[PDB]
């Protein structure tokens, strides 16, 4: 390996094998000092170390690993593929980052809200290596990006147009109102025409470099897709609004420029570990042994608990304490050891070797050592990744600062508590070795096929397996079921629906079983041509699957999603990133790539990910690294937009914090408007909309215990067709992550109902969490609260009257046709929300969190308020109703005779239709509910909470029985007319 | 069979009897079979405790055994068995690698290790660059013990001459390759008439041949080349037939000679005689064997601290040299035996054999945990660098004693068990250094007596390998003024786990220190006492501090 010294000096080194040859830095340094007195002089002025670089594909690569040359096998492999035996490695100086580079890093830190460069809370370099490794997918996505299409970011869908929208096209024609200057012309175009065809038709109906941009929005109708396939066109058709566009010059792609990457490419960390035959010590001469295979170590796993150190004792419970160490792989405890109970004081000493029954060779990748401090009940927890991200077993002393509790995603984090000065600390010792112990490469090759089976299953065992496969995800598998699934694993591949159960039947605590599983999934084909099922992929991405290959399988199926489909499940994927044992996972790469590919997905990813950085200390660093990668990826125009969004968010944070400490709000608003308020900023919950000035005279503060800010902004686009403002509620002191998760689930449910051609008029609003207990909510205009409608006439003293809501809706209807449309919309929306809240289990609400528009549509708001109460109590100690079906709703629907009515019958029919539609996607709904409980809850969840949905979704029952069940739920709702609302009013008062 | 029983009895602890059962040359191979079987069982069951004693027994037996048979596979089986140990933690795989290198050297050159050890100990002429020698000093005050004084006298005898040492080395080297096919009686009879220069030349040639064969790279080729070179040397020097000369001539043990041990009493003068014995050697490594009870632990630690301050500009270490310290109890030994079960069974528990075994086969230094004490006087002068095992603090009769001592006399009355008038004591203790977070806490009250003890004195009933210190408040104030309830009156034994301590007195109430009843040290009149915890005294044991 020839080396090029920093003076063009070429020192011809020789290949020194692979044993302890990362003194190659020191070797080449000493050789340079000997071979050049200039190097001797520079030794007194040179940096601490240097960098070794090469050129894998013309682009410059770095050898970023200081342990062994076995890592550097990729450069040698490329050189031998190109057949250039003398390889060139350039030794370059550790030049400090430039001034512009540091300024850009400071801007990125300001945007993220976390300092990724801070290495004060890391016991390894997994986060820094992830930062270096995410450069390759980022550069791949930036290079393979359409400039014009990225700049204009069209929002399209390939799903078929629903029939309830098809009936809204009068004569297979759509009218588009095109605006040029102040002139407006209506052009009739068929729904199968691309925007280019419409534009050519407009020009023929008398340059050609123009695009159609939605008036008042930053949304473009461009690309080669039918005009009916645009999400904006479908939205306008659904709302019956007129489609207005303006003839705008295309945005310059040059504005989306990405600055050059400072770092050379890091390649991969899979080089340090090879096949077992390469790492094993058997057959060696005890002098060529430079690394030891993990599968050679036949001893039991052993960890020395040295002690426990706390600055000040908590006063909740004391008088006894012990440590429980669990070797576990994805919430499955492989082994568990306990220490002797000792008196609980500030410093407790054991110095005891806990030796598990699991062999060292049987530790899987992603195995987790969970150290938990129990009392006498559980007090503290911390986790350590037994196998490092370089496939290396952990060695040495570890002083891990523990997490204090106050099934949960936060219980799986490998991060250490940043509060060094006040947190519990546990000291452990893992055995040191002369040679590093490396877990061999996952699977060399399934050439023997693992004895793929030939014999047919008996009919009875086939029936048993098929019955097991058809069962719901939450149904536990007994020992016999797991044995049947694994014993016939090669038959379980043929059914993709059995993959979660099949991989739950794998004994991850045995090395040979894991090798057999890898051989099994190396020959997956029925899964590859399988149609994409979102529920199955979500199941494979749950907390029960810590294996890298299963996650890779799930992400490989995720890659076939559309942009809008990814937008549907983006929050769920971001939350599922928590379950990945390692920072640089396939899910993180997938999210980064698909946020760099689409501008809307990128915007929502930035906000969803910044919220988790701000509020969750457990996954601050991983999410911060991912967000830094994305922000380096996106163009400079979208970086400026993000900067303006963060500026307005922070200044409104300050204003909310100052007001909540207490006409004053008005004055603070004129102080903002005259200084530090951006001229226009993109709305966080709606990237297509740009809010300009602030209508200070219309802002106020609600009479709430949280005192949120009611702000109304001016639309910054001069092309807007209405003087309507933009309403935004900035709330402090409430966790909006649960609220936004519930809203995402509602949007998914609405998409399902649309798929089955049902329009329930259920529309979720725009809620984005922006920081620790602070967030932003869209204001739905012409809407009020049912509680406020009641309090208009009766309800201040608790009395409730049935005619209030019907009369209120009648008063807001200018004509009788408007009243009938409002009544129909109310029926549909009430059915949709009743079904949704019954399925999700958040149906037991009160009037203060249910709203209605003047058009009849119904809303549920403030989901964080009731979700926590439901989790804590479950309504079992009070009078619980499945959902809020109040007698005023019934009066709006029927004649209040408590027998029937045509509108009530229609409500029952449509709600039954929606219930069966959801039962069709039961599995996806169940997995979404499970992820929401795992990730969105700051508390700790368990069973009897997750499984509630499989009782609400009527799992394992006939369609007629499910219909009867929902009718019984409706009847019990009708039984408790005002009792539950009166009880809620008493509890609040 | 009886050798296996003796081995088993030795492990589950017998020791000298076990070493002496190997009186016949085949007993060595039988014991090696047994040790290899025990090692295989240990590895299969993952027993960490038995690895170090078994490794040491194997090393000693292979060192002493004469002429591994040509058809024997003990060396290869042992090499495979130990090479299987490379997956073990560091303190065990280190011994593994040492034995692997030793086994490879003994397989390539049958008598390399015994020749190396005996040549180094006897200080015989060496043609290798930077020739080495081994010197043993037995530091015995005339008041240590009669039996130990006699065994030191037995070791101190010069004994074998260079002529006899050369004869023994040549006999062992030639038998290790020509076991039953050499006339050892005839070879010795011919060697007895050889001159000293001839013996030196023959030994240098044979040693060079053995060192060259130790790195040939092929075991069979190395053995063949060594055999050919030894035959050539024998033919050159007039040796009799050594190639299949006589089947009747059987094997001889050729035991290790007594090393040239020097017995000199240093009279506790901070290791002065080591320089004298360097100077005499001038006219490499030296082994210091310290005999004595706990009363000289302070003297030993002062001596080693002085040596560690001085060697930077002293000829003891600048010249190629290695200083090793061995301790025989005749409570450092309690701590060492607690860490090392082999040391507990062999040293802490016919005696010259055990002393020589401890000197020769203890190669893992254990650093004794010693406490650095610094005292600030009442007169403004600051003293530092005091070393102890326990401490008695606060006694006013003891500060009367220290005032009587002054700046140039012994502190008569510092022994403790003395009534103390109440004094204004401030106690500062640091806690939590296990996690790197040192938390200082302060009390300021009236006190008379405080105990500052090391857990290692009573570590047999506590957390394993605890280097922390215990601060005990007991028997306070009641010795003089039991009714002084304002201070630390009475106070039952209260223990605080501490690492750094600062005890502050007052000018009107002078403070005192009792350094394990050491009245030799001079300290004028101290007030402030600071005790702080790799440190000092690397006493060699058979197996280091296993984690």
UniProtKB/Swiss-Prot annotation, chain A:
One of its GO terms (molecular function) is protein serine kinase activity. Residues 695-978 form the PI3K/PI4K catalytic domain. GO terms for cellular component: cytoplasm; cytosol; membrane; phosphatidylinositol 3-kinase complex, class IA; phosphatidylinositol 3-kinase complex, class IB; plasma membrane. Keywords: Angiogenesis, ATP-binding, Cell membrane, Chemotaxis, Cytoplasm, Disease variant, Endocytosis, Immunity, Inflammatory response, Kinase, Lipid metabolism, Membrane, Nucleotide-binding, Phosphoprotein, Serine/threonine-protein kinase, Transferase. Residues 860-886 are annotated as: Activation loop. Residues 297-431 form the C2 PI3K-type domain. It is found in: Cytoplasm; Cell membrane. It comes from the Eukaryota. Residues 1-95 form the PI3K-ABD domain. CDD domains: C2_PI3K_class_I_gamma, PI3Ka_I, PI3Kc_IB_gamma. ATP binds at residues 727-736, 762-770, 859-867. Residues 701-707 are annotated as: G-loop. Its EC number is 2.7.1.137, 2.7.1.153, 2.7.1.154, 2.7.11.1. Heterodimer of a catalytic subunit PIK3CG and a PIK3R5 or PIK3R6 regulatory subunit. Interacts with GRK2 through the PIK helical domain. Interaction with GRK2 is required for targeting to agonist-occupied receptor. Interacts with PDE3B; regulates PDE3B activity and thereby cAMP levels in cells. Interacts with TPM2. Interacts with EPHA8; regulates integrin-mediated cell adhesion to substrate. Interacts with HRAS; the interaction is required for membrane recruitment and beta-gamma G protein dimer-dependent activation of the PI3K gamma complex PIK3CG:PIK3R6. This is Phosphatidylinositol 4,5-bisphosphate 3-kinase catalytic subunit gamma isoform. It comes from Homo sapiens. The lineage of its organism: Eukaryota, Metazoa, Chordata, Craniata, Vertebrata. The gene is PIK3CG.
UniProtKB/Swiss-Prot annotation, chain B:
Signal peptide: none annotated. It is found in: Nucleus; Cytoplasm; Cell membrane. One of its GO terms (molecular function) is G-protein beta/gamma-subunit complex binding. Greatly activated by G gamma proteins. One of its GO terms (biological process) is positive regulation of phosphatidylinositol 3-kinase/protein kinase B signal transduction. Residues 350-449 are annotated as: Interaction with beta-gamma G protein dimers. Residues 14-74 are annotated as: Heterodimerization. Keywords: Acetylation, Cell membrane, Cytoplasm, Membrane, Nucleus, Phosphoprotein. The keyword tRNA-binding does not apply. Pfam families: PI3K_1B_p101. One of its GO terms (cellular component) is phosphatidylinositol 3-kinase complex, class IB. It comes from the Eukaryota. It is a peripheral membrane protein. Regulatory subunit of the PI3K gamma complex. Required for recruitment of the catalytic subunit to the plasma membrane via interaction with beta-gamma G protein dimers. Required for G protein-mediated activation of PIK3CG. Heterodimer of a catalytic subunit (PIK3CG/p120) and a regulatory (PIK3R5a/p101) subunit. Interacts with beta-gamma G protein dimers. The heterodimerization region allows the binding to the catalytic subunit. This is Phosphoinositide 3-kinase regulatory subunit 5.
